[PDB]
Design an enzyme around this catalytic site. Structure first.
Site, PDB file in Angstrom:
ATOM      1  CD  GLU A 185       6.215  -5.098 -26.360  1.00  0.00           C
ATOM      2  OE1 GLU A 185       6.358  -5.422 -27.554  1.00  0.00           O
ATOM      3  OE2 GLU A 185       6.194  -5.926 -25.426  1.00  0.00           O
TER       4      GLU A 185
ATOM      5  CG  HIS B 138      10.574  -8.964   8.941  1.00  0.00           C
ATOM      6  ND1 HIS B 138      10.088  -9.240  10.201  1.00  0.00           N
ATOM      7  CD2 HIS B 138       9.588  -8.301   8.293  1.00  0.00           C
ATOM      8  CE1 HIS B 138       8.861  -8.764  10.310  1.00  0.00           C
ATOM      9  NE2 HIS B 138       8.532  -8.191   9.167  1.00  0.00           N
TER      10      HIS B 138
ATOM     11  CE  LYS C 266       2.423   8.847   2.590  1.00  0.00           C
ATOM     12  NZ  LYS C 266       3.479   9.728   3.128  1.00  0.00           N
ATOM     13  CG  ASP C 267       0.820   1.405   1.128  1.00  0.00           C
ATOM     14  OD1 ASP C 267       1.030   1.611  -0.077  1.00  0.00           O
ATOM     15  OD2 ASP C 267       1.737   1.159   1.927  1.00  0.00           O
TER      16      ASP C 267
ATOM     17  CB  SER D  25      11.962   0.579   5.801  1.00  0.00           C
ATOM     18  OG  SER D  25      11.820   1.056   4.476  1.00  0.00           O
TER      19      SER D  25
HETATM   20  C1  HEM Z   1       8.253  -8.498  -9.308  1.00  0.00           C
HETATM   21  C2  HEM Z   1       9.285  -7.707  -9.037  1.00  0.00           C
HETATM   22  C3  HEM Z   1       9.454  -6.949  -7.697  1.00  0.00           C
HETATM   23  C4  HEM Z   1       8.615  -6.813  -6.657  1.00  0.00           C
HETATM   24  C5  HEM Z   1       7.184  -7.340  -6.436  1.00  0.00           C
HETATM   25  C6  HEM Z   1       9.278  -6.012  -5.675  1.00  0.00           C
HETATM   26  C7  HEM Z   1       8.744  -5.646  -4.474  1.00  0.00           C
HETATM   27  C8  HEM Z   1       9.390  -4.969  -3.476  1.00  0.00           C
HETATM   28  C9  HEM Z   1       8.795  -4.626  -2.209  1.00  0.00           C
HETATM   29  C10 HEM Z   1       7.349  -4.953  -1.768  1.00  0.00           C
HETATM   30  C11 HEM Z   1       9.700  -3.970  -1.505  1.00  0.00           C
HETATM   31  C12 HEM Z   1       9.540  -3.408  -0.069  1.00  0.00           C
HETATM   32  C13 HEM Z   1       8.519  -2.283   0.035  1.00  0.00           C
HETATM   33  C14 HEM Z   1       9.180  -0.986  -0.303  1.00  0.00           C
HETATM   34  O1  HEM Z   1      10.417  -0.887  -0.150  1.00  0.00           O
HETATM   35  O2  HEM Z   1       8.474  -0.041  -0.708  1.00  0.00           O
HETATM   36  C15 HEM Z   1      10.893  -3.904  -2.310  1.00  0.00           C
HETATM   37  C16 HEM Z   1      12.066  -3.313  -1.922  1.00  0.00           C
HETATM   38  C17 HEM Z   1      13.229  -3.305  -2.648  1.00  0.00           C
HETATM   39  N1  HEM Z   1      13.401  -3.866  -3.891  1.00  0.00           N
HETATM   40 FE1  HEM Z   1      11.964  -4.876  -4.907  1.00  0.00          FE
HETATM   41  N2  HEM Z   1      10.529  -5.680  -6.132  1.00  0.00           N
HETATM   42  C18 HEM Z   1      10.665  -6.238  -7.375  1.00  0.00           C
HETATM   43  C19 HEM Z   1      11.774  -6.140  -8.162  1.00  0.00           C
HETATM   44  C20 HEM Z   1      12.945  -5.555  -7.781  1.00  0.00           C
HETATM   45  C21 HEM Z   1      14.042  -5.268  -8.647  1.00  0.00           C
HETATM   46  C22 HEM Z   1      14.101  -5.578 -10.147  1.00  0.00           C
HETATM   47  C23 HEM Z   1      15.008  -4.707  -7.944  1.00  0.00           C
HETATM   48  C24 HEM Z   1      16.321  -4.282  -8.590  1.00  0.00           C
HETATM   49  C25 HEM Z   1      17.383  -4.084  -7.837  1.00  0.00           C
HETATM   50  C26 HEM Z   1      14.572  -4.588  -6.571  1.00  0.00           C
HETATM   51  C27 HEM Z   1      15.248  -4.050  -5.488  1.00  0.00           C
HETATM   52  C28 HEM Z   1      14.695  -3.634  -4.288  1.00  0.00           C
HETATM   53  C29 HEM Z   1      15.331  -2.905  -3.212  1.00  0.00           C
HETATM   54  C30 HEM Z   1      16.781  -2.406  -3.133  1.00  0.00           C
HETATM   55  C31 HEM Z   1      14.461  -2.702  -2.247  1.00  0.00           C
HETATM   56  C32 HEM Z   1      14.754  -1.959  -0.930  1.00  0.00           C
HETATM   57  C33 HEM Z   1      13.775  -0.818  -0.629  1.00  0.00           C
HETATM   58  C34 HEM Z   1      14.313   0.049   0.482  1.00  0.00           C
HETATM   59  O3  HEM Z   1      15.144   0.954   0.215  1.00  0.00           O
HETATM   60  O4  HEM Z   1      13.917  -0.179   1.648  1.00  0.00           O
HETATM   61  N3  HEM Z   1      13.295  -5.123  -6.522  1.00  0.00           N
HETATM   62  N4  HEM Z   1      10.673  -4.512  -3.513  1.00  0.00           N
END
Ligand code: HEM
Ligand SMILES: CCCCCCCCCCCCCCCCCC(=O)OC[C@H](COP(=O)([O-])OCC(O)COP(=O)([O-])OC[C@@H](COC(=O)CCCCCCCCCCCCCCCCC)OC(=O)CCCCCCCCCCCCCCCCC)OC(=O)CCCCCCCCCCCCCCCCC
Ligand SMILES: CCCCCCCC/C=C\CCCCCCCC(=O)OC[C@H](COP(=O)(O)OCCN)OC(=O)CCCCCCC/C=C\CCCCCCCC
Ligand code: HEM
Lengths: 137, 378, 79, 106
Positions: free
Chosen positions: B270, B200, B226-227, B204
């Protein structure tokens, strides 16, 4: 289109539409009916009563679609909006209840006297939160 | 008046899901991250109906799972959903990450850095509790990983025995590894609740790389449906794998009850670690070797400030698109190497991947982003 | 504080649209799905394949060579 | 360095402009720049007959990609009439930062 249409286009328009029995001669006030009819018979009777060209159009009941138009123009101070659905015709007996129903919504403008507690439920809210300049039905 | 905007609880959810400006071109790829959320609620939920029954008795542990996958109603279903529903939570990760190295998604410094931490925590819980089915693969990988951290010159002797509760696996170890599984999980959920607070306040992205505040549509009726549609498409593949061919993704060597009297012949974990285990044994020098193993999850924080282009995303960069597909093929050859005995070319060849995972994104990608800056005059 | 009232400024533009109930949702799906894929696959079939193509060669080379020196050791195990 | 062989080099300059596909979607080059905080101030200095054009080009050339066509081949922005309408408003914001910096330093 208001740059090309010339004398010929106008003269046949005047010939094909201005004719009887599409016309009505109406009068009100201190007129006398017999005198009016006598005066009508003198100046008007030199008139073509038989249809010219037999140009009789056929009425097409109107289509009604659900579209929406949006024009942006960000530098004006205020915004205008209108919304509508389909309704009856002239001779339909459903017009009177729709009049009685639209008189319950009402109207309001920001210079009325006793706002903020006038009987409509929409006027009384706009007056007290100040959302409107005006609305109508 | 409008209850959706004056109640203390519904302001929070209207502003968060129902009514937030969203772009309109988003690729499906913006899809997957939500799926991970579905996985998160299912691993927690299915995983408590096992700690109900399991017994941290060093000579009672293995027969425990053996009676659960026979004895009780529907337990054979739940065991396998728990063993397979994390072969796919690890599927999701490699896609949600690789995309952010396509659509310039790291310039979100705050969002990006509270990521890598989660990567480390999730990657460690699975190892920390795949050694307590209490089988030979479980003990004989525990021993091997344990003996490395013990090669620190002054660190090693003392730390190693604190986790064993003695000298070797006994009642004093299985108990505190089963201590570990319970708590890494809850802590992780709170780091995910904070990832989004950052989200927020920047909104996006969009798969072109140009700010579009001009045309933002809501996130009700569109992103909500869509989701839901794609989500009820993950439950086709998950269930087909589990209820048709479960035994496919495992190994037949957590069935002989644990013994110190045997030793497995071709030990290998694994699939989804053999990558950060192929660097390890690729090189001599044990103290050094442990360091090159973690050079990787910290290679990543070093890559927001090596950016050297003028535009965002690879869509308009057709010459860099070549180098991004020699990264993934590198990570595929490097996983074919690992789970396999040592022969003549395996050492020479696995070596190249180790040399290259670093030469691609350390030298090459910041020096080949100027050769094309010079071509459009920026 | 960045809701639907305050964002970018734009001017002099216009857009049109119908409803969903006055249209059908399958305008020639069969006769327009295929050409799009035909035109787009060509462009990026060349941009995902060749990087991946040099792994088949090395994998088959190593597999067959190791198979030789495992199933046919008694060739060079000279008596 | 070279001049006679640079006519070869000009050729490859035509190649790259055809490889990257920002002309296919109806754009000019300066529409595709990443807006950090030096380019957020040289956009607020545009005259208001060039600011509005950049808004209409982007809003049309961004709804093509949620529909997944492209635009007719006669409509592609030709190579040589492309316009660098933003180089001059940007090689002044940068030139004045550097100055506040030699001040503080030395
Ligand atoms: C339990 C682990 C994780 C969860 C539940 C998670 C979940 C999410 C969610 C819900 C979003 C926003 C929805 C979306 O963009 O589709 C997001 C965005 C993002 N996440 Fe994660 N993520 C996880 C791990 C990671 C990891 C390991 C990285 C490594 C860099 C990361 C980097 C990002 C980035 C850069 C975005 C931005 C998306 C955009 O371009 O708008 N996340 N993540
Ligand atoms: C859960 C388990 C996770 C695993 C899921 C797998 C990936 C699913 C996914 O998210 O992909 C979304 C994606 C949905 O497509 P989209 O919403 O239109 O745009 C997303 C693409 O990223 C946008 O791509 P695009 O539309 O711009 O076009 C790219 C693609 C062409 O992409 C497409 O147009 C796919 C849709 C064609 C209709 C297919 C009808 C059935 C045939 O062409 C290529 O570059 C691929 C190289 C040539 C392959 C030709 C095969 C095309 C068929 O699915 C595919 O792209 C299908 C092809 C990828 C499969 C690769 C597997 C190889 C083995
Ligand atoms: C590793 C072990 C895990 C196995 C998982 C299997 C991963 C396979 C991913 C399948 C993707 C390959 C087919 C994709 C279809 C395709 O090519 O679509 C083309 C499409 C065209 O997109 P446009 O926006 O239109 O660009 C302009 C084009 N003119 O290209 C893309 O979208 C590319 C998207 C990139 C996703 C990357 C997938 C994962 C790759 C990871 C690389 C290495 C990551 C390293 C991280 C290691 C630590 C976790
Ligand atoms: C990110 C979340 C989690 C992951 C990735 C994870 C991973 C795993 C894996 C891979 C196994 C191996 C099971 C097998 O091979 O048979 C396992 C076992 C187990 N986990 Fe989890 N786990 C998670 C959360 C939890 C939680 C939250 C609990 C309890 C609160 C828990 C309790 C257990 C127990 C008791 C076992 C042993 C039961 C058995 O082997 O059948 N796990 N876990």
């Amino acid at each position: 289109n208001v740059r090309k249409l010339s004398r010929a286009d106008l003269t046949e328009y005047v010939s094909q539409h201005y004719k009887a029995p599409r016309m009505v001669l109406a009068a009100a006030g201190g007129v006398e009916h017999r005198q009016l009819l006598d005066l009508a018979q003198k100046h008007f009777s030199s008139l073509s009563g038989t249809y010219v060209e037999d140009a009789v159009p056929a009425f097409t009941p109107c289509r009604f679609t659900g579209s929406e138009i949006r024009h942006r123009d960000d530098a004006l101070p205020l915004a205008h909006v209108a919304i509508a659905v389909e309704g009856p015709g002239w001779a339909n007996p459903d017009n009177v209840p729709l009049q009685v129903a639209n008189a319950i919504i009402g109207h309001y403008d920001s210079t009325y006297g006793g706002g903020t507690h006038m009987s409509s439920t929409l006027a009384s809210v706009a007056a007290t939160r100040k959302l409107c300049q005006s609305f109508q039905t | 008046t409008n209850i959706r905007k004056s109640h203390p609880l519904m302001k929070i959810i209207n502003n968060a899901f129902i009514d937030l400006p969203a772009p309109s071109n988003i690729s499906s790829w913006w899809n997957f991250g939500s799926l991970l959320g579905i996985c998160l609620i299912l691993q927690i939920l299915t995983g408590l109906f096992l700690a109900m029954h399991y017994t941290s008795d060093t000579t009672t542990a293995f027969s425990s799972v053996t009676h659960i996958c026979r004895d009780v109603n529907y337990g054979w279903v739940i065991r396998y959903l728990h063993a397979n529903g994390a072969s796919m939570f690890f599927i999701c990760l490699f896609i949600h990450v690789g995309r952010g190295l396509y659509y310039g998604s790291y310039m979100f410094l705050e969002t990006w850095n509270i990521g890598v931490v989660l990567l480390f925590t999730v990657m460690a819980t699975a190892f920390m509790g795949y050694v307590l089915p209490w089988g030979q693969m479980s003990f004989w990988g525990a021993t091997v990983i344990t003996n490395l951290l013990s090669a620190i010159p002054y660190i090693g002797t003392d730390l190693v025995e604190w986790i064993w509760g003695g000298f070797s696996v006994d009642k004093a170890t299985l108990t505190r590894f089963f201590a570990f599984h319970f708590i890494l999980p809850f802590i992780i959920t709170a780091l995910a609740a904070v990832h989004l607070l950052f989200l927020h306040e920047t909104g996006s992205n969009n798969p072109t790389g140009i700010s579009s505040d001009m045309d933002k549509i809501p996130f009700h009726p569109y992103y909500t449906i869509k989701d839901i549609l794609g989500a009820l498409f993950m439950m086709l593949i998950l269930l087909i794998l589990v209820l048709f061919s479960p035994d496919l993704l495992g190994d037949p060597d957590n069935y002989t009850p644990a013994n110190p009297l045997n030793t497995p012949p071709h030990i290998k974990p694994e699939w989804y670690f053999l990558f950060a285990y192929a660097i390890l044994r690729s090189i001599p020098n044990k103290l050094g070797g442990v360091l090159a193993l973690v050079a990787s999850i910290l290679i990543l924080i070093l890559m927001p400030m090596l950016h050297t282009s003028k535009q965002r995303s690879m869509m308009f960069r057709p010459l860099s698109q070549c180098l991004f597909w020699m990264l993934v093929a590198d990570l595929i050859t490097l996983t074919w190497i690992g789970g396999q005995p040592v022969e003549h070319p395996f050492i020479i060849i696995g070596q190249l991947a180790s040399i290259l995972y670093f030469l691609i994104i350390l030298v090459l990608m910041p020096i080949t982003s100027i050769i094309e800056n010079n071509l459009l005059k920026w | 504080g960045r809701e639907f009232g305050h964002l970018t400024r734009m001017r002099h533009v216009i857009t049109y649209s119908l409803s969903p109930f006055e249209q059908r949702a399958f305008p020639h799906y069969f006769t327009k799905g295929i050409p799009n894929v035909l035109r787009r696959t060509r462009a990026c079939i060349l941009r995902v394949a060749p990087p991946f193509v040099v792994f088949y060669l090395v994998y088959t080379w190593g597999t067959q060579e190791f198979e030789k020196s495992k199933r046919k050791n008694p060739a060079a195990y000279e008596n | 360095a070279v001049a006679a062989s640079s006519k070869w080099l000009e050729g490859i300059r035509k190649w790259y402009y055809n490889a990257a596909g920002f002309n296919k979607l109806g754009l000019m080059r300066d529409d595709t720049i990443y807006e950090d905080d030096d380019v957020k101030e040289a956009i607020r200095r545009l005259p208001e007959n060039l600011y509005n054009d950049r808004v209409f080009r982007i809003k049309r050339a961004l709804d093509l990609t949620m529909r997944q066509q492209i635009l007719p081949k006669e409509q592609w922005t030709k190579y040589e009439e492309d316009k660098f309408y933003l180089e001059p408003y940007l090689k002044e914001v940068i030139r004045e930062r550097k100055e506040r910096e030699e001040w503080a330093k030395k």
